[PDB]
Write a protein that binds this ligand. Structure first.
Ligand SMILES: CNc1ncnc2c1ncn2[C@@H]1O[C@H](CO)[C@@H](O)[C@H]1O
Length: 165
């Protein structure tokens, strides 16, 4: 069903993540971690303290799809297992040095063709697929986008809920 999912998303904040490659999203799905550039890292840390849930919605560039969504379980932390990210041209490992822990809510894909009716007020009412890495998605648009994803029957939101309050 969708009731625990709606509960997790209630009063959540949503951010679009644009990965330049599939490799890093696969790593994030396997290891439960994400890193972003310093400008976005600061925004996510602020959001983590402000809301009951912060949701990252992932899209690999040129894939025409979202690859899933996850909830931040921590602020960014440096000084751990150095993650073997595939680095785009012009990006350091120190730039991706902040590592957020994430709990996946849905690891299934959603094609952009299925979200064409959703626009994001925080990005000039452009279709929600459009946005730079880190673009915040307004609550109602983000909730509806997350609810469009196919259910992921492999995930039990019980332990995710157990970390909220
Ligand atoms: C692990 N983290 C990441 N992996 C791959 N691409 C990323 C990324 N974080 C940001 N990017 C993208 O890299 C671009 C800059 O080269 C940004 O505009 C994002 O779209």
């Amino acid at each position: 069903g969708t009731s625990k999912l709606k509960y997790v998303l209630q009063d959540a904040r949503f951010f679009l993540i644009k990965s330049n490659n599939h490799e890093n999203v696969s790593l994030a799905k396997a290891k439960g971690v994400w890193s972003t550039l310093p400008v976005n890292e600061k925004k996510l840390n602020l959001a983590f303290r402000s809301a009951r849930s912060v949701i990252l919605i992932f899209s690999v560039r040129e894939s025409g799809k979202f690859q899933g969504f996850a909830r931040l379980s921590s602020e960014s932390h440096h000084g751990g297992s150095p993650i073997h990210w595939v680095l785009p041209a012009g990006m350091s490992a120190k730039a991706l040095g902040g590592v957020f822990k994430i709990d996946w809510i849905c690891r299934r894909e959603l094609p952009f063709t299925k979200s064409a009716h959703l626009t994001n007020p925080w990005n000039e009412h452009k279709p929600v697929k459009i946005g730079r890495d880190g673009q915040e998605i307004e609550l109602e648009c983000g909730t509806q986008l997350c609810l469009l994803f196919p259910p992921d029957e492999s995930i039990d939101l019980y332990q995710v809920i157990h970390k909220m309050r």
